[PDB]
Every structure is written in structure tokens, then in C-alpha cells.
Enzyme design. Structure first.
Site, short mmCIF file in Angstrom:
data_model
loop_
_atom_site.label_atom_id
_atom_site.label_comp_id
_atom_site.label_asym_id
_atom_site.label_seq_id
_atom_site.Cartn_x
_atom_site.Cartn_y
_atom_site.Cartn_z
N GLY A 1 0.83 -1.19 0.00
CA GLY A 1 0.00 0.00 0.00
C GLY A 1 0.88 1.25 0.00
N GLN B 1 2.68 10.12 1.40
CA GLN B 1 3.97 9.47 1.57
C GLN B 1 4.93 9.82 0.48
OE1 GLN B 1 1.93 5.42 2.37
NE2 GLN B 1 3.93 5.33 3.38
N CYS C 1 4.80 -0.11 7.49
CA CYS C 1 4.54 1.06 6.65
C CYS C 1 5.84 1.46 6.00
CB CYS C 1 4.05 2.21 7.51
SG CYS C 1 3.70 3.73 6.61
N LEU C 2 5.81 1.72 4.69
CA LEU C 2 7.04 2.11 3.99
C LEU C 2 7.64 3.39 4.55
CD1 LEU C 2 6.07 1.34 0.27
CD2 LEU C 2 7.63 0.03 1.77
N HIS D 1 -5.35 1.11 6.43
CA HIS D 1 -4.09 1.77 6.75
C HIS D 1 -3.86 2.94 5.76
CE1 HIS D 1 0.34 1.65 7.74
NE2 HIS D 1 0.35 2.26 6.58
N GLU D 2 -4.10 2.69 4.48
CA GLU D 2 -3.89 3.78 3.53
C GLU D 2 -4.90 4.89 3.65
OE1 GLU D 2 -1.08 3.95 2.15
OE2 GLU D 2 -0.60 1.90 2.83
N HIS E 1 -3.84 7.26 6.24
CA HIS E 1 -2.82 8.24 5.76
C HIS E 1 -3.45 9.49 5.14
CE1 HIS E 1 1.19 6.55 6.10
NE2 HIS E 1 0.78 5.38 5.60
#
Ligand code: NI
Length: 151
Positions: free
Chosen positions: A46, A51, A90-91, A132-133, A136
């Protein structure tokens, strides 16, 4: 395509709630195309626009090949049922993983690249990624919902 730099915790852009997309233009399509390959090159499932430094409600997830890539613009969760507890990463927080409880089933309303509204139902890992996304896009990071980090 361009490999976009993925912004790491810490950075203020990550906690900034995103504006709704109003113009479904060529720049939006390029953003989504660049995000998807950038995400996969980084071994992520994701990625959200903040981000990569863009404060718009745009994210993409891609877990299974059958399902494939799911681009989400201005997504909202219409329904949530059940719960699932498990690891989340998470990236933007390399190597950081924590246990997070998320809804197990979700029904999502979102728009595609042309602005058309679709309905999507997801469960399990895909539903976790989508939740999760979407967080963000509202300036919420998973660390705010971690119950415990792993040893
Ligand atoms: Ni993330």
C-alpha cells in the site's frame, strides 16, 4: 514513470490531512502510475499520496495478483464488520512493525481516475491495507493504533 521518494517518519507532510481530489486530470493519472511502481519497487502493498509528498486523497494497494491493483481516490469506508489483530508495517517507517487491530470486513466507496464512483468490499489483509492507507489520507499514522511492538 518516475520512482518517487517515499517520505520517512519524521516529516510533517505525513500528519497532514489531505484535500479531496477535484480535478481528475493527467497529473493525477501520472501520480497514481508512479505511486504504484514506486510502491512495488519498495516491496510495499500500500502507498498513499502524502507518503510521496502530495496532500491529496489518493492511495493505491496491491496485494494479490488475482485482485490486483486497486487505486482509491477520495475513499470513504461505508461499513466495517468484525475484527482482526496482526502485524502492520509502513514504507514510511522502515523496519517498524506493530500489532494493530483493524476491522476484518469493509465496504468502501471511492472514485477511479476518471472520477467515477465504485463500491468495493474487502476482507482480511486487503481490508487491513486499505484501512491503513485511508488513515494516511486523513493524516493518521499506524503508530497511533499500535497496541504493542514486536521484540
Ligand atoms: Ni503507511
Amino acid at each position: 514513470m518516475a520512482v518517487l521518494e517515499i517520505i520517512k517518519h519524521p516529516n510533517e507532510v505525513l500528519e497532514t490531512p489531505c484535500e479531496r481530489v477535484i480535478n481528475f486530470d493527467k497529473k493525477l493519472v501520472k501520480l497514481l502510475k508512479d505511486m504504484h511502481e514506486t510502491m512495488l519497487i519498495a516491496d510495499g502493498v500500500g502507498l498513499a499520496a502524502p507518503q510521496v509528498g502530495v496532500s491529496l486523497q489518493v492511495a493505491v494497494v496491491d496485494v494479490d495478483d488475482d485482485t490486483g491493483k486497486i487505486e482509491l481516490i477520495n475513499p470513504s469506508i461505508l461499513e466495517k464488520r468484525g475484527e482482526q489483530v496482526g502485524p502492520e508495517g509502513c514504507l514510511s517507517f522502515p523496519g517498524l512493525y506493530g500489532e494493530v487491530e483493524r476491522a476484518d470486513y469493509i465496504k468502501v466507496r471511492a472514485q477511479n481516475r476518471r472520477g467515477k464512483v465504485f463500491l468495493l468490499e474487502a476482507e482480511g489483509f486487503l481490508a487491513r491495507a486499505i484501512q491503513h492507507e485511508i488513515d494516511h489520507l486523513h493524516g493518521v499514522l499506524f503508530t497511533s493504533k499500535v497496541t504493542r511492538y514486536y521484540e
